[PDB]
Amino acid sequence: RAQHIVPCTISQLLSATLVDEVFRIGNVEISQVTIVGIIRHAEKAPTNIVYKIDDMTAAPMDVRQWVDTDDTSTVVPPETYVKVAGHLRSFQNKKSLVAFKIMPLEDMNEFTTHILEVINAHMVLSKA
Amino acid sequence: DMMDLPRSRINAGMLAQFIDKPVCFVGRLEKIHPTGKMFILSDGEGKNGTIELMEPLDEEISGIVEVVGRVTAKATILCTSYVQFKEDSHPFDLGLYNEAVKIIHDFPQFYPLG
Numbered sequence: 639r640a641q642h643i644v645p646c647t648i649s650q651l652l653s654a655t656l657v658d659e660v661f662r663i664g665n666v667e668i669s670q671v672t673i674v675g676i677i678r679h680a681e682k683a684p685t686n687i688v689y690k691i692d693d694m695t696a697a698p699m700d701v702r703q704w705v706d707t708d709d710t711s712t713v714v715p716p717e718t719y720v721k722v723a724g725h726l727r728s729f730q731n732k733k734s735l736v737a738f739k740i741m742p743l744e745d746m747n748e749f750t751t752h753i754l755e756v757i758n759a760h761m762v763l764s765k766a
Numbered sequence: 767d768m769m770d771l772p773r774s775r776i777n778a779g780m781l782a783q784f785i786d787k788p789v790c791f792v793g794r795l796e797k798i799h800p801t802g803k804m805f806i807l808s809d810g811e812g813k814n815g816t817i818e819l820m821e822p823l824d825e826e827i828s829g830i831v832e833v834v835g836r837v838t839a840k841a842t843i844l845c846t847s848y849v850q851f852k853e854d855s856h857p858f859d860l861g862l863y864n865e866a867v868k869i870i871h872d873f874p875q876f877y878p879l880g
Binding site: 647649650653676678694717744746747750753754760764 | 769770771772773774775790830834849851852853854855856858859862863866869870873875876877878879880
């Protein structure tokens, strides 16, 4: 009942259905996801930051992040490849992520790796 | 403005099979036309794909380049956008990136093609 992180493509997030606040792919539910993509745009909102993050699998998805401007423990620039860990969300039928970490990739071999992780993770659920 | 479409990740050998489709092509910069309006990339099995631009490059390009564009009737790519990969820590293993591509096209159901 806790706590599982499924690596995903943005299109996999789009394909997920929402019944009574529960997101499902097949008979399996999430919640917590990682994706890897590029920051296309970055807005400063009143209470947080809205990134548009593009993995090539669909149109960019909105991802909200919170930052403490008196800390480095600062907006990631556009054109950056980024790993994202967050929770899947939906308001008024619009999918988006709520992020807990946004780690810029210094080694793009992590991006290759993530693809394989996506693929194997969904081979696994598929069998459930 | 194909930034809101799915873009298949492909190697050179699938250019023919993706004519007219939006694509994302990763390879190593082999050569640049004197005009800056086309250049060549090689993928992880040493195959070439020709990339074309409506306007000349702004800057030097080298190493691994990730190009987004539409595959042309002649199996070329019209570049809409590109990003240069950095390799400050570890060099990008292009060969395994190519293995990863093959896998995407063998299992579209697990890397939903958008």
